[PDB]
Design an enzyme around this catalytic site. Structure first.
Site, PDB file in Angstrom:
ATOM      1  N   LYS A 134      22.989  79.030 -55.596  1.00  0.00           N
ATOM      2  CA  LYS A 134      23.070  79.149 -54.143  1.00  0.00           C
ATOM      3  C   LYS A 134      22.219  80.312 -53.592  1.00  0.00           C
ATOM      4  O   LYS A 134      21.646  80.244 -52.494  1.00  0.00           O
ATOM      5  CB  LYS A 134      24.526  79.281 -53.712  1.00  0.00           C
ATOM      6  CG  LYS A 134      25.315  77.978 -53.822  1.00  0.00           C
ATOM      7  CD  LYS A 134      24.903  76.972 -52.744  1.00  0.00           C
ATOM      8  CE  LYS A 134      25.856  75.769 -52.674  1.00  0.00           C
ATOM      9  NZ  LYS A 134      25.688  74.973 -53.921  1.00  0.00           N
ATOM     10  N   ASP A 146      25.733  70.353 -49.732  1.00  0.00           N
ATOM     11  CA  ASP A 146      27.070  70.980 -49.809  1.00  0.00           C
ATOM     12  C   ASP A 146      27.136  72.307 -49.069  1.00  0.00           C
ATOM     13  O   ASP A 146      26.166  73.073 -49.064  1.00  0.00           O
ATOM     14  CB  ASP A 146      27.517  71.180 -51.277  1.00  0.00           C
ATOM     15  CG  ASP A 146      26.515  72.026 -52.120  1.00  0.00           C
ATOM     16  OD1 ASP A 146      25.306  72.000 -51.842  1.00  0.00           O
ATOM     17  OD2 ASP A 146      26.938  72.708 -53.092  1.00  0.00           O
ATOM     18  N   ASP A 147      28.289  72.573 -48.448  1.00  0.00           N
ATOM     19  CA  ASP A 147      28.571  73.877 -47.862  1.00  0.00           C
ATOM     20  C   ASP A 147      27.549  74.285 -46.805  1.00  0.00           C
ATOM     21  O   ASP A 147      27.014  75.410 -46.813  1.00  0.00           O
ATOM     22  CB  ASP A 147      28.623  74.948 -48.954  1.00  0.00           C
ATOM     23  CG  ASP A 147      29.828  74.824 -49.867  1.00  0.00           C
ATOM     24  OD1 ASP A 147      30.687  73.935 -49.677  1.00  0.00           O
ATOM     25  OD2 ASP A 147      29.906  75.655 -50.792  1.00  0.00           O
ATOM     26  N   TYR A 163      32.374  66.261 -50.336  1.00  0.00           N
ATOM     27  CA  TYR A 163      32.190  66.184 -51.776  1.00  0.00           C
ATOM     28  C   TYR A 163      33.492  66.208 -52.565  1.00  0.00           C
ATOM     29  O   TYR A 163      33.489  66.201 -53.805  1.00  0.00           O
ATOM     30  CB  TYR A 163      31.239  67.290 -52.267  1.00  0.00           C
ATOM     31  CG  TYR A 163      31.586  68.730 -51.885  1.00  0.00           C
ATOM     32  CD1 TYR A 163      32.680  69.393 -52.450  1.00  0.00           C
ATOM     33  CD2 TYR A 163      30.785  69.444 -51.016  1.00  0.00           C
ATOM     34  CE1 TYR A 163      33.001  70.714 -52.102  1.00  0.00           C
ATOM     35  CE2 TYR A 163      31.087  70.764 -50.689  1.00  0.00           C
ATOM     36  CZ  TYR A 163      32.199  71.381 -51.241  1.00  0.00           C
ATOM     37  OH  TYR A 163      32.477  72.688 -50.938  1.00  0.00           O
ATOM     38  N   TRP A 185      30.805  66.702 -60.575  1.00  0.00           N
ATOM     39  CA  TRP A 185      30.609  68.151 -60.565  1.00  0.00           C
ATOM     40  C   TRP A 185      31.981  68.783 -60.744  1.00  0.00           C
ATOM     41  O   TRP A 185      32.784  68.808 -59.825  1.00  0.00           O
ATOM     42  CB  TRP A 185      29.989  68.529 -59.204  1.00  0.00           C
ATOM     43  CG  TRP A 185      29.692  70.012 -58.885  1.00  0.00           C
ATOM     44  CD1 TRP A 185      30.536  71.106 -59.051  1.00  0.00           C
ATOM     45  CD2 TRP A 185      28.525  70.514 -58.211  1.00  0.00           C
ATOM     46  NE1 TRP A 185      29.926  72.241 -58.571  1.00  0.00           N
ATOM     47  CE2 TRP A 185      28.698  71.907 -58.053  1.00  0.00           C
ATOM     48  CE3 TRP A 185      27.347  69.915 -57.738  1.00  0.00           C
ATOM     49  CZ2 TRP A 185      27.719  72.722 -57.457  1.00  0.00           C
ATOM     50  CZ3 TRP A 185      26.382  70.702 -57.160  1.00  0.00           C
ATOM     51  CH2 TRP A 185      26.575  72.104 -57.008  1.00  0.00           C
ATOM     52  N   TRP A 186      32.271  69.264 -61.934  1.00  0.00           N
ATOM     53  CA  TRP A 186      33.588  69.910 -62.190  1.00  0.00           C
ATOM     54  C   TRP A 186      33.593  71.429 -61.979  1.00  0.00           C
ATOM     55  O   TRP A 186      32.932  72.158 -62.678  1.00  0.00           O
ATOM     56  CB  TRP A 186      34.050  69.599 -63.605  1.00  0.00           C
ATOM     57  CG  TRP A 186      35.451  70.006 -63.928  1.00  0.00           C
ATOM     58  CD1 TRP A 186      36.551  69.767 -63.189  1.00  0.00           C
ATOM     59  CD2 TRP A 186      35.900  70.683 -65.119  1.00  0.00           C
ATOM     60  NE1 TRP A 186      37.675  70.261 -63.822  1.00  0.00           N
ATOM     61  CE2 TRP A 186      37.299  70.827 -65.014  1.00  0.00           C
ATOM     62  CE3 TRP A 186      35.253  71.193 -66.253  1.00  0.00           C
ATOM     63  CZ2 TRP A 186      38.074  71.456 -66.010  1.00  0.00           C
ATOM     64  CZ3 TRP A 186      36.027  71.797 -67.243  1.00  0.00           C
ATOM     65  CH2 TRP A 186      37.428  71.922 -67.105  1.00  0.00           C
ATOM     66  N   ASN A 187      34.356  71.900 -61.010  1.00  0.00           N
ATOM     67  CA  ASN A 187      34.363  73.313 -60.712  1.00  0.00           C
ATOM     68  C   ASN A 187      35.230  74.168 -61.623  1.00  0.00           C
ATOM     69  O   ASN A 187      36.209  74.755 -61.186  1.00  0.00           O
ATOM     70  CB  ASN A 187      34.716  73.514 -59.264  1.00  0.00           C
ATOM     71  CG  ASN A 187      33.528  73.316 -58.391  1.00  0.00           C
ATOM     72  OD1 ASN A 187      32.432  73.863 -58.666  1.00  0.00           O
ATOM     73  ND2 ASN A 187      33.697  72.503 -57.359  1.00  0.00           N
ATOM     74  N   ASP A 232      33.303  81.961 -58.704  1.00  0.00           N
ATOM     75  CA  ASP A 232      32.602  82.617 -57.608  1.00  0.00           C
ATOM     76  C   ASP A 232      33.500  82.898 -56.392  1.00  0.00           C
ATOM     77  O   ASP A 232      33.079  83.544 -55.433  1.00  0.00           O
ATOM     78  CB  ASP A 232      31.251  81.905 -57.284  1.00  0.00           C
ATOM     79  CG  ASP A 232      31.408  80.492 -56.649  1.00  0.00           C
ATOM     80  OD1 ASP A 232      32.494  80.159 -56.126  1.00  0.00           O
ATOM     81  OD2 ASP A 232      30.386  79.720 -56.650  1.00  0.00           O
ATOM     82  N   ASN A 279      30.030  73.317 -63.361  1.00  0.00           N
ATOM     83  CA  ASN A 279      29.655  74.508 -62.592  1.00  0.00           C
ATOM     84  C   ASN A 279      30.347  75.737 -63.221  1.00  0.00           C
ATOM     85  O   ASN A 279      31.584  75.806 -63.223  1.00  0.00           O
ATOM     86  CB  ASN A 279      30.153  74.356 -61.152  1.00  0.00           C
ATOM     87  CG  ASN A 279      29.511  75.364 -60.180  1.00  0.00           C
ATOM     88  OD1 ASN A 279      28.405  75.894 -60.409  1.00  0.00           O
ATOM     89  ND2 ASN A 279      30.220  75.643 -59.112  1.00  0.00           N
TER      90      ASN A 279
HETATM   91  C1  LIG Z   1      29.780  68.539 -55.463  1.00  0.00           C
HETATM   92  C2  LIG Z   1      30.389  69.911 -55.151  1.00  0.00           C
HETATM   93  C3  LIG Z   1      29.377  70.882 -54.507  1.00  0.00           C
HETATM   94  C4  LIG Z   1      30.022  72.243 -54.302  1.00  0.00           C
HETATM   95  N1  LIG Z   1      29.506  73.327 -53.716  1.00  0.00           N
HETATM   96  C5  LIG Z   1      30.187  74.654 -53.764  1.00  0.00           C
HETATM   97  C6  LIG Z   1      29.706  75.418 -55.026  1.00  0.00           C
HETATM   98  O1  LIG Z   1      28.380  75.905 -54.863  1.00  0.00           O
HETATM   99  C7  LIG Z   1      30.705  76.507 -55.464  1.00  0.00           C
HETATM  100  O2  LIG Z   1      30.179  77.003 -56.682  1.00  0.00           O
HETATM  101  C8  LIG Z   1      32.120  75.896 -55.656  1.00  0.00           C
HETATM  102  C9  LIG Z   1      33.208  76.938 -56.028  1.00  0.00           C
HETATM  103  O3  LIG Z   1      33.249  77.950 -55.030  1.00  0.00           O
HETATM  104  O4  LIG Z   1      32.520  75.288 -54.430  1.00  0.00           O
HETATM  105  C10 LIG Z   1      31.696  74.300 -53.856  1.00  0.00           C
HETATM  106  S1  LIG Z   1      31.602  72.740 -54.670  1.00  0.00           S
END
Ligand SMILES: CCCC1=N[C@@H]2[C@@H](O)[C@H](O)[C@@H](CO)O[C@@H]2S1
Length: 586
Positions: A163, A239-240, A279, A334-336, A341, A369
């Site tokens: 990011k 995302d985000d 997502y 995408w497994w968090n 973070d 991730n």
């Molecule tokens: C398909 C999911 C895309 C996502 N983007 C953010 C990611 O950059 C962070 O690392 C994670 C944990 O804070 O939260 C969301 S999940």
């Protein structure tokens, strides 16, 4: 323990010698990355005169003609055979042959091989890591190390998307990388290629994207520049973000454009992946049509990423059906975990678990991730690799122990000790938790109730608690001085110090419980206050990030226990000797 576990394995209880003299067949026809590995494992000599025959190749190669029935008809599949007579290392394709050799390397112990027949292939098509976290991106050295680790564990995907990299995200996703960074990414691509990993370069443009021809061309021109550095797989992350960039119709059109004018135009583009703005299930609008627009609009070769029912969650049968319905394709997970973070004062070093093991067919990919702590992340990454290759055979704890012993053979038990009590996230905005210190949790809980009552404790309990603290210090001191994986030690150091101080505080608090006389008690109490202050110092000076600054350790079971026992023996003392001792732990 092989790692990931093969789909099919037959072990004869015979073992053979790695050939003193051998005959190589296919060395010039087979995958050069595989031949490289094979030649490294071998210390001469070659013999046309023969020589045990070793055959290496892909289905279609003249070297492996005899065994084409044996080769699994799956992408990245292979057939491996060791017996008295012959060794066979036959891939369905080039990556399969490399994988044959990654299993082969693991069988060879002390210069000998078991007699085995293996038929193997992955249950999930794409398996690997997205470096997609917020925080300090992985160092160039850490990435080179990751890519070699990915090859050994049959991970075929690395998605580059930190990011905080300015040339990945806004503004500056429009600009080509400076020469230095460019030459570094080039080197990452070379090394990823050698290890059979798709380097997937991601762009994250949606925060300031203009839906005009100018920004669209800038995106392709960036993609083109990345192509010239060797990149053959691409991603666009939405995302985000907020603003105009969230528009699903514009997103799908953009991605289709990239497909049409770039992915379908170059000779050798592998993955094309996108990350939706919605997502996870919980952040999706049920009444409006973000996800169905994507599912309908996006060319069917494009992957769509998904985290499950919440931002941080584990994948269920119901959760994947829900999304797969809407996107009209199997979700690319995408497994968090173990991603920290948003709990940056914690290390997440426990086992990988929680994901349904029967749904391989319902996902096109599975990526982890990780933490900004690259080497630390290898415990989970190794485990995810094992899980995504053979989920049916996935064993949580054994894979975790296997990971630890592979990462730090010289101090594996020490690392287990440390990881066992550095697992849980603590309270957080996402409500996601992991188990921690479960071994000692019953002892901890018995001991503490039998106090907050006055009812006498168990001697068994007392010395498990005391055995634990002792083990914690041994592990903490051995780890600090370990030189086999220095970069790992550097990542964990602050928490290693804090973990020692927790163990010491534990030991003094128990010496206060056996409080022999009034002034030995006060020596103990004063030593405890001093150790608390040291932990506070570390928490105030180490890892001072703007979000969750500091260093927390053994937080779920151990810190609470010690804190509560301390406030307890002190309060009993403030009433046996009618004192004014400070019982607080902050
Ligand atoms: C398909 C999911 C895309 C996502 N983007 C953010 C990611 O950059 C962070 O690392 C994670 C944990 O804070 O939260 C969301 S999940």
């Amino acid at each position: 323990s092989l790692q990931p576990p093969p789909q099919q394995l037959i072990v004869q209880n015979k073992t053979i010698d790695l050939p003193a003299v051998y005959q190589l067949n296919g060395g010039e026809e087979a995958n050069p990355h595989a031949v490289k590995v094979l030649k490294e494992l071998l210390s001469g000599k070659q013999s046309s005169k023969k020589g045990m025959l070793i055959s290496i190749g892909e289905k279609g190669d003249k070297s492996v003609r005899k065994y084409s029935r044996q080769i699994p008809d799956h992408k990245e599949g292979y057939y491996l055979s060791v017996n008295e007579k012959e060794i066979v290392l036959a891939g369905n394709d080039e990556r399969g042959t490399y994988y044959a050799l990654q299993t082969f390397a693991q069988l060879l112990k002390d210069g000998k091989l078991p007699e085995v027949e293996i038929k193997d292939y992955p249950s999930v098509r794409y398996r690997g890591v997205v470096e997609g976290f917020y925080g300090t991106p992985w160092s160039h050295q850490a990435r080179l190390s990751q890519l070699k680790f990915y090859g050994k564990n049959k991970m075929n995907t690395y998605i580059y998307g930190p990011k905080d990299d300015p040339y990945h995200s806004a503004p500056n996703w429009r600009l080509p990388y400076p020469d230095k960074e460019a030459a570094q990414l080039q080197e990452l691509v070379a090394v990823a290629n050698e290890n059979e990993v798709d380097f997937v370069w991601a762009i994250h443009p949606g925060q300031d994207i203009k839906w005009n021809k100018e920004d669209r061309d800038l995106l392709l021109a960036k993609f083109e520049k990345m192509y010239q550095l060797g990149v053959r797989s691409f991603a666009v992350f939405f995302d985000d973000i907020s603003g105009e960039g969230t528009n699903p119709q514009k997103q799908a059109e953009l991605l289709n454009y990239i497909d049409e004018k770039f992915a379908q135009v170059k000779p050798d583009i592998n993955q094309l992946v996108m990350c939706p703005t919605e997502y996870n299930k919980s952040w999706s609008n049920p009444n409006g049509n973000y996800l169905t627009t994507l599912g309908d609009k996006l060319n069917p070769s494009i992957q769509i990423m998904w985290t499950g029912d919440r931002v941080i969650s584990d994948i269920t049968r119901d959760g994947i059906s829900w999304i797969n319905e809407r996107i009209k394709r199997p979700a690319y997970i995408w497994w968090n975990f173990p991603v920290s973070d948003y709990v940056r004062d914690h290390l997440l070093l426990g086992p990988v678990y929680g994901n349904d093991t029967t749904i391989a067919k319902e996902m096109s990919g599975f990526v982890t991730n990780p933490m900004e702590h690259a080497e630390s992340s290898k415990i989970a990454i190794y485990s995810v690799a094992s899980y995504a290759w053979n989920p049916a055979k996935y064993d949580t704890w054994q894979t975790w122990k296997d990971a630890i012993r592979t990462i730090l053979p010289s101090a594996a038990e020490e690392l287990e000790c440390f990881a066992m009590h550095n697992s849980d996230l603590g309270p957080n905005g996402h409500g996601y938790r992991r188990e921690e210190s479960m071994d000692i949790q019953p002892a901890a809980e018995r001991f503490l109730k039998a106090f907050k009552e006055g009812k006498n404790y168990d001697k068994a309990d007392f010395e498990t608690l005391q055995y634990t603290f002792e083990r914690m210090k041994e592990s903490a001191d051995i780890l600090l001085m370990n030189t086999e994986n220095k970069p790992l030690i550097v990542e964990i150091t602050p928490w290693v110090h804090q973990f020692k101080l927790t163990a010491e505080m534990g030991e003094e608090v128990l010496k206060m419980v056996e409080g022999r006389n009034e002034s030995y008690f006060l020596r103990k109490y004063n030593h405890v206050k001093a150790l608390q202050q040291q932990m506070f110092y570390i928490d105030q000076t180490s890892n001072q990030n703007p979000y969750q600054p500091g260093v927390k350790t053994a937080t779920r079971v151990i810190k609470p226990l010690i804190d509560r026992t301390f406030a307890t023996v002190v309060k009993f003392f403030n009433q046996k000797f009618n004192a004014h001792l400070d019982a607080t732990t902050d």
